[PDB]
Amino acid sequence: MQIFVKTLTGKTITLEVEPSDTIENVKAKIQDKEGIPPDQQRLIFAGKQLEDGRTLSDYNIQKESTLHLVLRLRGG
Amino acid sequence: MQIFVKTLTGKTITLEVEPSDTIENVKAKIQDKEGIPPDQQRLIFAGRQLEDGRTLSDYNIQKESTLHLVLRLRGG
Amino acid sequence: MQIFVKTLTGKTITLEVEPSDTIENVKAKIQDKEGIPPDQQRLIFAGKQLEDGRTLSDYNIQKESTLHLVLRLRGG
Amino acid sequence: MQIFVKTLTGKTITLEVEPSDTIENVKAKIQDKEGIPPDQQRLIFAGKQLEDGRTLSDYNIQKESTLHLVLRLRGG
Lengths: 76, 76, 76, 76
Prior knowledge:
The complex is a heterotetramer, with three copies of chain A (about 80 residues) and one copy of chain B (about 80 residues).
Chain A: E1 2-7, E2 12-16, H1 23-34, E3 41-45, E4 48-49, E5 66-71
Parallel strand pairs in A: 1-5
Antiparallel strand pairs in A: 1-2, 3-4, 3-5
Chain B: E1 2-7, E2 12-16, H1 23-34, E3 41-45, E4 48-49, E5 66-71
Parallel strand pairs in B: 1-5
Antiparallel strand pairs in B: 1-2, 3-4, 3-5
Organism (chains A, B, C, D): Homo sapiens (Human)
Protein name (chains A, B, C, D): Ubiquitin
Subcellular location (chains A, B, C, D): Cytoplasm; Nucleus; Mitochondrion outer membrane
């Protein structure tokens, strides 16, 4: 399925994903497409930050859902 | 001065702040108004997550700037 | 003319530019294409950081030159 | 441990470093080896600029990592 990943700064990324993909898996897909290190990525759905170990289906993320992406620096 | 904090669920709150207020200080003001503990808050400006020890002026946050707020929960 | 702008993370951006375009102008084109705020962008040519008010022709940047882009996030 | 420091001109040095060494400490080592003043050095890992006060271990910089080095000076 397709999902959309939107920055707060105007950029939309389209990803090919499965319901069973972890957030870790999704961040790796973003790195593949955009070059953004997974340690620097924070993914957002339903106004909350998503955790690495959970699946898309765990958050009820479906076909044509929009996630948001923000950057974290620190030690990432 | 006033700043705006907008959730990713589309709710806007107004805060009374100083340029030299830390991100920690701002999070405390959000807790005062909204009841959200600072550990569960992530503040965002210009598509980047803000660090606790840095000031509003460190990020060039000025009168009537908009920050974004996302929740960072464990287990949801 | 076309120039290439490469991140250190393996992303390439193609831009339509003029010799007389400033570094500032290039940054605004990057913001248009990528959503990256100009304040966060550092542009690199011949292994050095470029200055805002200089032109492409001032650095002898021509058709199909490669610039590098790194982020400097204000604050954290 | 061994690290690489690579300029965007492909000028590559190796350094002997400890996980506990600060970015500032690394810059001093680069000055010692390569004659580059610390003020003119911007060190990059995973496409992000590193902060002077933070350690190699803080960024999870390990055995055989490459840091990128960009020169910053006004007037060229």
